[PDB]
């Protein structure tokens, strides 16, 4: 029994620990350090929970290894279930059959949700043929349903047998399902009040003729721009005036924004100045990089025009003392115990090498611990794994040969 959800780099943390005073705990949900980044992330996260404004952009800055993606994934789980969240890489918007504006526009639209309350009754159960009156049977109770001449001609063409579970809805819906008994639940007469949270794909069902095809894949190219505004904003606007539906804001995350086309940066101007639009959490891992397509030098590889539309939150590298603590937190992931002297060698390696390498040293060493038939890892184990796998800084020294440079 192995679920699809598995242990991973960002999968070990669940939720973002916060307090009423917005004071980040020392160790909360597997997160240690970055008190300023966690506090500011809690402020902008509260801004997401309030939903008083739209079209905001937050850019976090810092050195590689400060947990930029870990903060975004931490805020994603703390947003709560049944809420739209869209996190896309900078290369996902590129498409040959689709325009560069279509992917970003749909990225802004798909994050905004709509809550609609509809009350519909559902009568579902078994079927018993009696000669036209069908007796609906369920585990809890059984009732008799009389039928006229309207549904007889419809059931003669359709395939209906005794024992099959049928679901009929007062919406006048008809759904035929398998028996699922020899191979239902509840009551036959029930009044169901259900709140259906709907995404912004209403633009796609109104634009397209059928939503079944385009619901399972990206499908069609860029939709007409006038339909997204006049018709969609008109219907949603009237729904806000009537009070039937309530739009719920959402989060849109983009990682590695340092490399992007200038067209996207020019479109983000109107994207942020648009009436409705989700907040933007941006993560740039490079201080100064030339924007692709032109020759320029700007901070965070972004134009100076869009530079003032982002709220930058700086981060600090983790201290050597906190590395042992977060590694102790990572020890609980695989349920593998380490000796007290092993954290000194592992942290010592993590000082001169990247942190993720030390994250892989424990998991890689636990397998050799299994080969040693021991119940706990040893210093010789991690010292052997360090000889088996070496850091980039160590492998660079052995590249001084340059036998074939391919130059």
């Amino acid at each position: 029994v192995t679920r699809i959800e598995r242990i991973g780099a960002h999968s070990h943390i669940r939720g973002l620990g916060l307090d009423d005073a917005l004071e980040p705990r020392q160790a909360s949900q597997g997160m240690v350090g970055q008190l300023a980044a966690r506090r500011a992330a809690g402020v902008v996260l509260e801004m997401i929970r309030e939903g008083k404004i739209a079209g905001r952009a937050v850019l976090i800055a810092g050195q590689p290894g400060t947990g930029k993606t870990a903060i975004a994934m931490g805020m994603a789980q703390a947003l709560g279930p049944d809420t739209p969240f869209t996190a896309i890489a900078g290369s996902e918007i590129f498409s040959l059959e689709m325009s560069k504006t279509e992917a970003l526009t749909q990225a802004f639209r798909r994050s905004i949700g709509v809550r609609i309350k509809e009350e519909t009754e559902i009568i579902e159960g078994e079927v018993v043929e009696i000669q036209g009156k069908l007796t609906l049977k369920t585990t809890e109770m059984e009732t008799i349903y009389d039928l006229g001449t309207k549904m007889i001609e419809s059931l003669t063409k359709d395939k209906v047998q005794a024992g099959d579970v049928i679901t009929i809805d007062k919406a006048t819906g008809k759904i035929s399902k398998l028996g699922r008994s020899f191979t239902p639940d509840g009551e036959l007469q029930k009044r169901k009040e259900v709140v259906h949270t709907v995404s912004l794909h209403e633009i796609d069902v109104i634009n397209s003729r059928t939503q079944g095809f385009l619901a399972l894949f990206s499908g069609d190219t860029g939709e007409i721009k006038s339909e997204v505004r006049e018709q969609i904003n008109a219907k949603v606007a009237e729904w806000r005036e009537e009070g039937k539906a309530e739009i719920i804001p959402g989060v849109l995350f983009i990682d590695e924004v340092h490399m992007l086309d200038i067209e996207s940066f020019s479109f983000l101007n109107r994207a942020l100045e648009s009436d409705m639009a989700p907040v933007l959490i941006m993560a740039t891992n490079r201080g100064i990089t030339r924007i692709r397509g032109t020759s320029y030098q700007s901070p965070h590889g972004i134009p100076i025009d869009l530079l003032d539309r982002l709220l930058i939150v700086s981060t600090t590298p983790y201290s050597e003392k906190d590395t042992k603590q977060i590694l102790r937190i990572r020890c609980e992931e695989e349920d593998v115990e380490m000796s007290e002297d092993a954290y000194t060698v592992l942290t010592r390696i993590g000082l001169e090498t990247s942190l993720r390498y030390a994250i892989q040293l424990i998991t890689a060493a636990s397998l050799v611990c299994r080969k040693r038939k021991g119940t706990e890892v040893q210093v010789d184990d991690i010292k052997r794994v360090y000889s088996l796998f070496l850091d980039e800084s160590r492998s660079t020294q052995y590249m001084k040969e340059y036998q074939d440079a391919f130059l």
């Binding site: 192995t2 598995r6 991973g8 990682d255 892989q360 080969k371």
Partner: protein, 436 residues
């Protein structure tokens, strides 16, 4: 009928001892003990299934034979764990974008394991009149089956009866039936005439042998990619004359919101019911340094996902200009961002003393034994330029040895054929003169 020694068949996998140490020469693999243990850890990582999204790296000069070591990694895990290679040149596609290609590969690695008991009912079909009847329809099917081992009777549903009536079915015909409800039908499969003429055509076959009911245990493993592409498309066919010619199969990019969530939920329910068991895959990427930088920035974010399986990378060249940057250079043709977090495995050139050993293993694998002199001279030619030149020169030496009538290879044959086929180094020496 014959394996024909496809590619290199001398690799049976690592085959290391239970103590954990690696032999100098084991299972046709000689040397690379540090790479042997390095690749011996990752196979235990895959068999443990504790982590998802791990990254492996093979760093070595061209000709060290790390791809064959990856084949040993694939043979050690067995046929249970799905393993497929991905070349760096297949990411670029006109219809499907590169991001959707790589995503489809990450969905290709992981797979599901379903244990199903196949019940095969096949034989001569004698259709009795249905007993149930009345607002009439069918609702009950009674079909007899007669074979030389015995006769049985099977009751079927009217839906399967329509599935049989879709094709041409007549009395006294052999039909195959599976628990999947698929039934292979052949009109007039039994051998009979009764019409006084043999021109009925169709298929004339004698009565088959064996029992009617066949109970088997078949465990099928289906990759999640075929499930996403199969469920995303209507996957219908031959039910309409216009639609089958209308659909061009553009293979458009799937959406992550609806499809990944739906497949994830239904697979979670199927594995929670105990019907299916999810198994991780292995991704072996070649020429990773030749991908575009967008495939890198999408690649690290893709592998950082919890649902991403373990991926193996290989660097065939040293420091080179990154694809698409045209300015910034990075070691191993990979940027410093993705070069981090990926484990590094050292692969070193073999000493000249293993040349004759590897050539001997390839010789005994091909099935031809060579003399000690041809092994010494051929080994000297191998260590003089490259191992691939001698390994590829092993076959024509046996060919010329067989043409002349000799049962074994002699130094005159290998040294004679070495002058006919020029190595890349000598061919590069004859060139550069700027002639003709």
């Amino acid at each position: 009928k014959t394996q024909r020694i496809a590619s290199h068949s001398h690799v049976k996998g690592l085959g290391l001892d239970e103590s954990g140490l690696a032999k100098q020469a084991a299972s046709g693999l000689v040397g690379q003990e540090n790479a042997r243990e390095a690749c011996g850890v990752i196979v235990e990582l895959i068999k443990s299934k504790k982590m998802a999204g791990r990254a492996v790296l093979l760093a070595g000069p061209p000709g060290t034979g790390k791809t064959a070591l990856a084949l040993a990694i694939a043979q050690e895990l067995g046929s249970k764990v799905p393993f497929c290679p991905m070349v760096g040149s297949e990411v670029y596609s006109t219809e499907i974008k590169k991001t959707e290609v790589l995503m489809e590969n990450f969905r290709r690695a992981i797979g599901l394991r379903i244990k199903e008991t196949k019940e095969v009912y096949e034989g001569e079909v004698t259709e009795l009149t249905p007993c149930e009847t009345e607002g009439k329809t069918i609702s009950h099917v009674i079909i007899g089956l007669k074979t030389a081992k015995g006769t049985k009777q099977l009751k079927l549903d009217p839906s399967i009866f329509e599935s049989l009536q879709k094709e041409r079915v007549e009395a006294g015909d052999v039909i195959y039936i599976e628990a999947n409800s698929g039934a292979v039908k052949r009109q007039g499969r039994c051998d009979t005439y009764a019409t006084e003429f043999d021109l009925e055509a169709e298929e004339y076959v004698p009565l088959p042998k064996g029992d009617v009911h066949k109970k088997k245990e078949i465990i099928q493993d289906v990759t999640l990619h075929d499930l996403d592409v199969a469920n995303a498309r209507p996957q219908g066919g031959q039910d309409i004359l216009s639609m089958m010619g209308q659909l061009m199969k553009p293979k458009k990019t799937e959406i992550t919101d609806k499809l990944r969530g739906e497949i994830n939920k239904v697979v979670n329910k199927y594995i929670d019911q105990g019907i299916a068991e999810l198994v991780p895959g292995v991704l072996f990427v070649d020429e990773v340094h030749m991908l575009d930088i967008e495939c890198f920035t999408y690649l690290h974010r893709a592998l950082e996902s919890s649902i991403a399986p373990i991926v193996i990378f290989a660097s065939n060249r040293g420091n080179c200009v990154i694809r698409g940057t045209e300015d910034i250079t990075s070691p191993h043709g990979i940027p410093l961002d993705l070069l981090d977090r990926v484990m590094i495995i050292r692969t070193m050139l073999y000493t000249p003393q293993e040349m004759k050993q590897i050539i001997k293993i390839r010789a005994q694998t091909e099935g031809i034994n060579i003399s000690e002199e041809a092994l010494n001279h051929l080994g000297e030619i191998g260590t003089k330029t490259t191992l691939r030149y001698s390994v590829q020169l092993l076959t024509p030496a046996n060919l010329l040895a067989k043409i002349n009538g000799k049962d074994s290879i002699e130094k005159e044959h290998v040294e004679e054929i070495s002058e006919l086929f020029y190595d890349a180094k000598s061919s590069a020496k004859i060139l550069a003169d700027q002639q003709d």
